[PDB]
Amino acid sequence: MKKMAEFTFEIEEHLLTLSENEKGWTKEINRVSFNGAPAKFDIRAWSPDHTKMGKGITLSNEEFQTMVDAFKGNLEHHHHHH
Amino acid sequence: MKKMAEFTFEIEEHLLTLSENEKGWTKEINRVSFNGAPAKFDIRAWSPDHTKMGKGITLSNEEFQTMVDAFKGNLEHHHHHH
């Protein structure tokens, strides 16, 4: 019992543009809203004007923050962090 | 000759588990070694028994390094600044 049960996705906020790979395969990080304003962090490769599809994965804020803190102290080791 | 149609995948480095969703849907980030030497970053969701499609997106070293720098410099702001 819902009025028109269909999902609408749109790019809410542009976070990071990683790189465009292969042939028209753009891969970036932004927040996509699905019906309303539940814009979560979506890390996905987007298909070109022709065919194929990206293996992009969606993360919630909790999950997203988790990886960020880890990599914050781990991968970026060029600054002062023991 | 060797039948080069078998890309041997082995996870030599488990970065961190993000969250375990529902009950069997584990979502984490790890490095998968394809053939052996090329072990790059992969963000994949794993399913319970039988296992089903959980997306799973592979990122290259450069693209991964990119996001870590940016996310290290931000995002960590508490969702109640104003």
Which tokens is A53 given?
């599809």
CATH code, domain carrying A10: 2.30.31.70
Residue B32 contacts residue B19 (beta carbons within 8 Å): no
Q: In what order do the strands lie in the sheet with A25-34?
A: A9-21, A25-34, A40-46, A57-59
Q: Give the pair of three-digit tokens for residue B79.
A: 């969702």
Domain count along chain A: 1
Instruction: Find the domain containing B68 and state its range.
Output: 1-82
> CA-CA distance, A68 to B74, in Å (whole number)?
9
B53 touches chain A (CB under 8 A): no
Question: Bridge-partner residues for B32, per DSSP?
Answer: B11, B40
Solved with = NMR
Nearest-10 crossing angle of helices B61-72, A61-73: 100
Q: Which residues of B touch A21 (CB under 8 A)?
A: 60
Q: What share of chain B is helix, strand, coil (3-state, %, to 5)?
A: 15, 40, 45
Tokens coding B13: 């480095």
Answer yes or no: are the C-beta atoms of B29 and A67 closer than 8 Å.
yes
Long-range contacts of A28-31 (CB under 8 A, 24+ apart): A29/B67
Distance in Å, alpha carbon of A82 to nearest chain B alpha carbon: 15
Asked if A35 and A8 touch (Cβ cutoff 8 Å), the reply is yes
B26 lies within 8 A of chain A by CB: no
Backbone angles phi, psi at B24, to 5 degrees: 130, -15
Q: Which run of H or of E encompasses B27?
A: strand B25-34
**Contact: B67, A18; criterion CB under 8 Å:** yes
Sign of the C-alpha dihedral, residues A55, B18, A35, A13?
Answer: negative
Here the contacts of B11-15 (C-beta below 8 Å, separation 24 or greater) are B12/B39, B13/B39, B15/A67, B15/A70, B15/A71, B15/A74, B15/B41
DSSP string, A27-69: EEEEEEEESSS--EEEEEEE--SSS-----EEE-HHHHHHHHH
Task: Give the residue on A whose Cα is nearest the Cα of B58.
Answer: A55
A18, A57, A72: residue with CB nearest B63: A18
